[PDB]
Write an enzyme that holds these catalytic residues in place. Structure first.
Site, short mmCIF file in Angstrom:
data_model
loop_
_atom_site.label_atom_id
_atom_site.label_comp_id
_atom_site.label_asym_id
_atom_site.label_seq_id
_atom_site.Cartn_x
_atom_site.Cartn_y
_atom_site.Cartn_z
N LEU A 56 0.85 -1.29 -0.03
CA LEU A 56 0.11 0.01 -0.11
C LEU A 56 0.98 1.15 0.04
O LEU A 56 2.07 1.31 0.35
CB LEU A 56 -0.89 0.11 1.23
N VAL A 59 3.09 2.62 3.09
CA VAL A 59 3.78 1.54 4.04
C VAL A 59 5.10 1.41 3.45
O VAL A 59 5.13 0.93 2.39
CB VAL A 59 2.83 0.64 4.39
N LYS A 66 6.99 -3.60 11.68
CA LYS A 66 6.10 -3.38 12.95
C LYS A 66 4.81 -4.38 12.81
O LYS A 66 4.52 -4.70 13.96
CB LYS A 66 5.99 -2.07 13.45
N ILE A 100 -0.74 23.81 24.45
CA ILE A 100 0.40 23.03 24.78
C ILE A 100 0.84 22.19 23.76
O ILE A 100 0.16 21.08 23.59
CB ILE A 100 0.20 22.20 26.23
N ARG A 177 -19.63 19.24 3.76
CA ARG A 177 -19.79 17.89 2.94
C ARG A 177 -20.92 16.98 3.30
O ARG A 177 -20.85 15.85 3.05
CB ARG A 177 -18.42 17.22 2.92
N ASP A 184 -15.02 20.94 15.20
CA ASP A 184 -15.06 22.14 15.33
C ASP A 184 -16.14 22.99 14.28
O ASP A 184 -16.50 22.31 13.50
CB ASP A 184 -13.76 22.98 15.45
NA NA Z 1 -1.90 20.55 22.32
NA NA Z 2 4.66 0.87 0.07
#
Ligand code: NA
Ligand code: NA
Ligand code: NA
EC number: 2.7.7.7
Length: 327
Positions: A56, A59, A66, A100, A177, A184
């Site tokens: 894909l 990736v 992993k 933050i 959409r 928000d």
């Molecule tokens: Na933040």
């Molecule tokens: Na790939």
DNA sequence: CCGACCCGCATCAGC
DNA sequence: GCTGATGCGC
DNA sequence: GTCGG
């Protein structure tokens, strides 16, 4: 596809992404992981191996490795380690406060400040934005049901028109959409007296009126063209009060309004396709303008745009209703 | 191999 | 005080 | 981290 398909993998990738952004301060690693998580969230098959996933786009070898480890063991050693690491999970937690970012979260954790309770004890150390983000920590992590978004749109459109019937306001975002919920409210605003080649209070008057009717409750930042703040639907006078919500308002020159509306309506995939197509036809589209290309690639002057359709007309495309701009 | 990967406002660093 | 950098959220 | 010039 059903989360139960590759949800373990996309959960893993999302966690990895947040640690790159909030602890490693590696915004590009962060977005790669998010990219990978997306293309896999769309893949309609229970992945059996990392090699399957690597087919894909987004990736690579690392994420293939992993995924292999995750399938064989049900976990990632490095994720497990980072999860149990006090400093790292504390830094990663504090960034959930709006205002933050990775740097502030790092400085707070470097000073013993690791929790919401620690933040509540040290107001003195929080700028205005961060204090607001703390005040509404829970409300900001809630999604907004479309019915509330419509109630919010009603208020915004009404008060805008009450200030000046010549204003134009468009609630863009996934909401436009058709989405059944939003994170928000994104309001795009314009006025015929404001153009690229042309009042410093057009935005202020709208913000002011929305505060006067007690819709806008707080201000994160506000300048000549961009307002970021907090709003709340009025209480039913005996029902539980609605949660506070994030709202942005942007004032855009009239001659760039519909370009802006197109962009901030999205989706991001849709914009990419549109822009891709427009190059093929000798045009370049950004959030502000559409401009013609020369044979050599030199952009010309921005072309007149008086509606979203005009953009589509230029690039020889049938107008797509916002509902059909998923891609 | 190795660079690309998408700006308004608040606040700080420096002067 | 002014100008530019950086953090942040988008 | 992934891609691609
Ligand atoms: Na933040
Ligand atoms: Na790939
Ligand atoms: Na009027």
């Amino acid at each position: 596809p059903q989360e139960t398909l590759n949800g373990g993998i996309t959960d893993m990738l999302t966690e990895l992404a947040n640690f790159e952004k909030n602890v490693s301060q590696a915004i590009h690693k962060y977005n790669a992981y998010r990219k990978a998580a997306s293309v896999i969230a769309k893949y309609p098959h229970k992945i059996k191996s990392g090699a399957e996933a690597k087919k894909l786009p987004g990736v690579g070898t690392k994420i293939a490795e992993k995924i292999d480890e995750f399938l064989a063991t049900g976990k990632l050693r490095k994720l497990e380690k980072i999860r149990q690491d006090d400093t790292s999970s504390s830094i990663n937690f504090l960034t959930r406060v709006s205002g933050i970012g990775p740097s502030a979260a790092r400085k707070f954790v470097d000073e013993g400040i690791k929790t919401l309770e620690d933040l509540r004890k040290n107001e003195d150390k929080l700028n205005h934005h961060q204090r607001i983000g703390l005040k509404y920590f829970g409300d900001f992590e809630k999604r907004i049901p479309r019915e509330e978004m419509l109630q919010m749109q009603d208020i915004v459109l009404n008060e805008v028109k009450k200030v000046d019937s010549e204003y134009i306001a468009t609630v863009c975002g996934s909401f436009r959409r058709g989405a059944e919920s939003s994170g928000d409210m994104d309001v795009l605003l314009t006025h015929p007296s404001f153009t690229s080649e042309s009042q410093p209070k057009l935005l202020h008057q709208v913000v002011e009126q929305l505060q006067k009717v007690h819709f806008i409750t707080d201000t994160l930042s506000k300048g000549e063209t961009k307002f970021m703040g907090v709003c709340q639907l009025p209480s039913k006078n005996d029902e539980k009060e609605y949660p506070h919500r994030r709202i942005d308002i942007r004032l855009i020159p009239k001659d760039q309004y519909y370009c802006g509306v197109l962009y901030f309506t999205g989706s991001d995939i849709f914009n990419k396709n549109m822009r891709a197509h427009a190059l093929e036809k000798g045009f370049t589209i950004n959030e502000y303008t559409i401009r013609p290309l020369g044979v050599t690639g030199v952009a010309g002057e921005p072309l007149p745009v008086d509606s979203e359709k005009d953009i589509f007309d230029y690039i020889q495309w049938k107008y797509r209703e916002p509902k059909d701009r998923s891609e």
